[PDB]
Amino acid sequence: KSLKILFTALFGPGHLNACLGIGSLLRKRGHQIYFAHFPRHRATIEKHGFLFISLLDYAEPEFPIVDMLPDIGIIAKFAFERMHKLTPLELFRHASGKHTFAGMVNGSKGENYAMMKIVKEYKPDVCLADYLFNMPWMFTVDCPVIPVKSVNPIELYNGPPALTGCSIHDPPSVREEIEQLARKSELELESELEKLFAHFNVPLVSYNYAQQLGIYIYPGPLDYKELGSPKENWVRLDSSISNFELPEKLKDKPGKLIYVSMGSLASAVTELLTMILTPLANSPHRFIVSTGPNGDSIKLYDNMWGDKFINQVALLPKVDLFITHGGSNSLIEGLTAGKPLIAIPQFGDQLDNAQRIADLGLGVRLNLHEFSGEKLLKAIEDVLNDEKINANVARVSEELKKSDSKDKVISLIEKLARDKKL
Ligand SMILES: O=c1ccn([C@@H]2O[C@H](COP(=O)(O)OP(=O)(O)O[C@H]3O[C@H](CO)[C@@H](O)[C@H](O)[C@H]3O)[C@@H](O)[C@H]2O)c(=O)[nH]1
C-alpha cells in the first residue's frame, strides 16, 4: 500500500540533499512524496517528482517566517573574516557564550506553526525533517516524525563536543579549554530551545533527541565508532545520493585534474575563492572551479575553468583531487567517487568533517588561519602522490557502493509509517 510522506528542512543550505535522496528511494516504492519548504527551492523539489508545499503559505499571521529568516550571507561574510583571523580556540573565545546557531531558535516559531497546519491538513503517515535542532511540532503532530541529520554526526555521541574540529590525536589537556567554551555555548542553545518549546507548551527535549527513529547520513568508515554508539534510536544511512565533458581550455594543459568548490554560501565571499585560486596559478595542474553565485568576478588563470554551478556528482569521478569546504554532502559525494580531499573548513560542522578527513587519512585539513600559497601547493603535491591516502579513499568508496543501509533505512521508514511504532 502507498504512504503520504512529508519532508521539510531549514531555509538553507545543505539540509535538502539528504531529504531529496531519501525522498527518491521512497518515490521508487510508489509513495506520495510531499516537501514543505520555500519557493526558492521549488524547482529542485518538483524536478525530483515531489509535491511542493510552500511553508510561507501556512504561516500564522503573527509569524510570516520571512521576517525572522537568517541573513546567512551576512553570517557567512562574518564567518570568513573570523576564520581568516582566528584559531578555532580564539573563534570560541571571541564568540563569548554565543552558540553557532542558537540565534536561529527564536526565529523558528513561524516555521513551527506552518508545519503544525501542514501536517494537520495533509495528514502524512510520517514526516522527516533536516533541522539544526528539534522543533516543538515534531512532538505535537498526530504522526511519527524522523529527525534527519546531514551535519557531521559527532553531536550524536557522548564524546568531544561538535563544532570544535577536535582530532582523535588531540590530548585531553590540549582540548580542555575549547571544549569548556563549546559546552558553555551548548547551554545557550538548551536555554533558547527551552524558550521555543515553552512557547508551544511542549515538554523540552535535547535538540537531537529522536522519539522513535533518527537517520544520520555519514559513511560507516568515517562514523565515530571510537565513541561507541550514537544517541537512542539514531540509525546510520551511509549516503543519501548524466555525463561531463572536460573543458577545451584544460585540454593540453599539464598535470592532474583538481575540482575546487567552497560551497554555494562561502563562495559568495569572493575574497575566499580569490585567496585560494591566486596561488594555484603556478600549481602545475588543471582546476575546474565552482565559482559560486558571484563567480562572474572570480579571476581564473590559464590552468583553470569555472562555472557558477557545476554538475559536481558527474564531474567528481573524472578528477584526482577535491578542494572542499568540508560540507557533509561534498565529503560523501567525494568519497563515493573515490577522490581524496583537501578540506578548508568555513563554518560549524565543517571543522569536524575537515578533521575527520585528516584523522582517517582521507586527505588533509588546511585552515584559513594558517593558509599560505606554499602550504596549499605542497598539500596538493602530497595528497596526489600519497599511496596510503588513495588506498584509504578506495576502501571508503567500496564500502559506500556495497551498502544495504539504504534498504534497512527505507524499511524502518515504511514500518514506522505503518505501525506508528518500530
Ligand atoms: O558547483 C556546485 C556546488 C555545489 N553543488 C552541490 O551542493 C551541495 C553542497 O553540500 P555541502 O557540501 O554539504 O555544502 P553546504 O550545502 O554548504 O552544506 C551545509 O549543510 C551541510 C549539511 O548537509 C553541512 O555539512 C555543511 O557544513 C553546511 O555548510 C552538494 O550536493 C553538491 O553536489 C553542486 O552540485 N555544484
Strand partners, 304: 287
**Ligand 1: does its nearest atom lie under 6 Å from the Cβ of 150?**
yes
Closest C-alpha to 314, from 261, 247, 263, 242: 242
Measured from the CB, is residue 160 less than 6 Å from ligand 1? no
CA 149 to centroid of ligand 1, rounded, Å: 14
Which of 303-308's residues contact partners 24+ apart within 8 Å by CB, and which partners?
A: 303/250, 303/253, 303/254, 303/255, 304/250, 304/277, 304/280, 305/247, 305/249, 305/250
309 lines ligand 1 (CB under 6 A): yes
**Pair 340, 389: CB distance under 8 Å:** yes
Approach to solving: X-ray
Nearest atom in ligand 1 to the alpha carbon of residue 17 is 31
Closest CA to 261 of 338, 212, 319: 319
Ligand 1 pocket, residue 328 CB under 6 Å: yes
Equal fold, 4-240+402-419 vs 248-401? yes
Distance CA 33, CA 198 (A): 31
**Taking CA 196 as the corner, what is the angle to CA 233 and CA 118, rounded to the nearest 5 degrees?**
75
Give the cell for residue 197. Answer: 518549546
Mutate to test the pocket of ligand 1, among 17, 40, 148 (most ligand atoms within 8 A of CB): 17
Residue 355 marked as a ligand binder: no
CA of 331 to the centre of ligand 1 (A): 9
Domain 248-401 has CATH 3.40.50.2000: yes
Instruction: Say how many Å lie between the CA of residue 14 and the centre of ligand 1.
Output: 5
Helices then strands, each counted (H, E), the chain: 16, 13
Say how many Å lie between the first and final Cα of the chain, rounded. 18
Please report the resolution in angstroms: 2.3
Within 10 Å of residue 221's Cβ, how many Cβ atoms? Answer: 17
CA-nearest residue for atom 7, ligand 1, is 263
Q: Is 300 annotated as a binding residue?
A: no
Which of 156, 288, 329 should be mutated for ligand 1, with most atoms under 8 A from CB? 329
294 is in an annotated binding site: no
Bridge pairing between strands 126-130 and 145-149: parallel
Fold classified for 4-240+402-419: Rossmann fold (3.40.50)
In degrees, rounded to 5, the angle at the alpha carbon of residue 290 between the alpha carbons of residues 286 and 291 is: 105
3 state SS of 36:
strand
* Residue 237 phi, psi (nearest 5): -105, 120
Atom 31 in ligand 1: residue holding the nearest Cα: 329
| Residue in the structure block whose three cell numbers are 573565545 | 93
Euclidean distance between CA atoms 101 and 135, whole angstroms: 14
Q: What does 165-195 look like in DSSP terms, one character per residue?
A: ---TTS-HHHHHHHHHHHHHHHHHHHHHHHH
Helix (H) or strand (E) holding 291: none
Check pocket membership of 290 for ligand 1, CB cut-off 6 A: yes
Tell me which residue has its CA closest to atom 18 in ligand 1. 14
The answer to whether the CB of 327 is under 6 A from ligand 1 is yes
Asked if residue 103 has its Cβ within 6 Å of ligand 1, the reply is no
350 is in an annotated binding site: yes
Is residue 203 classed exposed, middle or buried when 0-12, 13-18 and 19+ CB atoms within 10 A define those classes? exposed
Ligand-binding annotation for 290, yes or no, is yes
The C-alpha cell that represents 65 in the structure block: 517566517
* Cα 409 from Cα 100, distance rounded (Å): 30
CA distance 6 to 231: 24
Which of 16, 241, 265, 330 has the most ligand 1 atoms within 8 A of CB, as the residue to mutate?
Answer: 330
Alpha-carbon span 164 to 290, nearest angstrom = 27
- List the chain domain ranges: 4-240+402-419, 248-401
For ligand 1, atom 4, the nearest C-alpha belongs to 263
List phi, psi (to 5°) of 210: -120, 110
